[PDB]
């Protein structure tokens, strides 16, 4: 049933897209996954991107994969839509900008009127829709791959509509990108998946380099900062999630998933005063683990909830 699961910008909302529509779940308690919204009028929803805890949502359906719909989900109204020359691979938004990622181009919209402010053309092919957008209005940067064969990151100022830097992050092509909440740090991983790096933004200085216990190569599918920027989680197509602590090389804490190979999305969220690792997995569950921010180590499972409600 499920096609999509993702967290909003401050980890207060979980979106689950399915063949029959989509749902939002709040993330403010532990005992139950509390559904706050369900839509059944749109089929095969492959992208659902909420703006924080507002009523604005951007939706893409497999029935019209080149069309972005911007809606007021509580009222159930379509505000406007936009169609692109190729399929939409990712949508990112903050309080000032909405970014649409195609394989070969990026569109930067003013979210106040949905006008296109700038189009980045002929990007290196980006079939994964890999990109990241800062949630901070003062450091409003977009990151996307500057090469399809080397791990270079283009950093683009979405307010002033100009390039800020290009960062040689990894030798192999990029696999994952994430901004911290301040917009001044960018976490990066390559297709080899052996090193997670953190760079300052826009200066591009390497600040941290983390090893995932070495070993073999993984396909990193998710990087996520905690809201205070002290912790960074990295998940993959394996059973291990690593959590790094950005104090002045190796994992500070780990979690062992009950599966090996499903794609998943992680986030670091504080719920009822306790920092937690949330894992939305393709097996249809949300897993919640308790993180000890002083001791680390292996994190215990607190709850697992069905993503379908």
């Amino acid at each position: 049933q499920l096609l999509f699961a993702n967290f909003n910008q401050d980890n207060t909302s979980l979106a689950v897209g399915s063949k029959s529509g989509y749902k939002f779940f709040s993330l403010s308690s532990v005992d139950k996954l509390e559904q706050i919204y369900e839509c059944t009028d749109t089929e095969d929803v492959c992208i659902v991107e909420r703006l924080f805890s507002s009523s604005l949502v951007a939706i893409v359906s497999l029935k019209a994969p080149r069309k972005l719909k911007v809606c007021h989900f509580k009222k159930g109204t379509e505000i406007c839509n936009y169609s692109y020359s190729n399929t939409i691979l990712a949508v990112k938004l903050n309080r000032q900008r909405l970014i649409v990622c195609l394989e070969e181009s990026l569109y930067i919209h003013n979210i106040r009127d949905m006008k296109v402010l700038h189009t980045i053309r002929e990007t290196p092919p980006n079939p994964a829709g890999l990109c990241a957008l800062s949630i901070n209005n003062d450091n409003c940067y977009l990151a996307y791959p500057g090469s399809a064969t080397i791990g270079e990151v283009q950093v683009f100022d979405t307010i002033n509509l100009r390039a800020a830097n290009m960062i040689p992050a990894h030798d192999s092509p990029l696999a994952a990108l994430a901004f911290d909440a301040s917009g001044t740090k960018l976490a990066t991983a390559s297709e080899k998946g052996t090193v997670i790096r953190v760079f300052s933004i826009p200066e591009g200085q390497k600040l941290f380099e983390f090893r995932r216990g070495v070993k073999r190569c993984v396909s990193i599918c998710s990087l996520a900062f905690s809201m205070d920027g002290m912790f960074l989680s990295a998940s993959s197509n394996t059973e291990t999630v690593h959590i790094f602590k950005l104090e002045t090389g190796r994992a500070f804490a780990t979690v062992r998933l009950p599966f090996c190979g499903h794609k998943n999305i992680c986030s670091l969220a504080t719920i009822q005063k306790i920092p937690r690792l949330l894992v939305g997995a393709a097996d249809g569950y949300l897993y919640m683990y308790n993180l000890d921010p002083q001791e680390g180590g292996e994190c215990a499972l607190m709850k697992q909830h069905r993503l379908d409600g």
Partner: peptide, 21 residues
């Protein structure tokens, strides 16, 4: 055709209303 005028007005009002936190 100045029909763009009132639709753009409604657009901006509706986007601001939806984005209200």
């Amino acid at each position: 055709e100045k029909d763009s005028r009132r639709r753009q007005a409604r657009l901006q009002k509706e986007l601001a209303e939806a984005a209200k936190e």
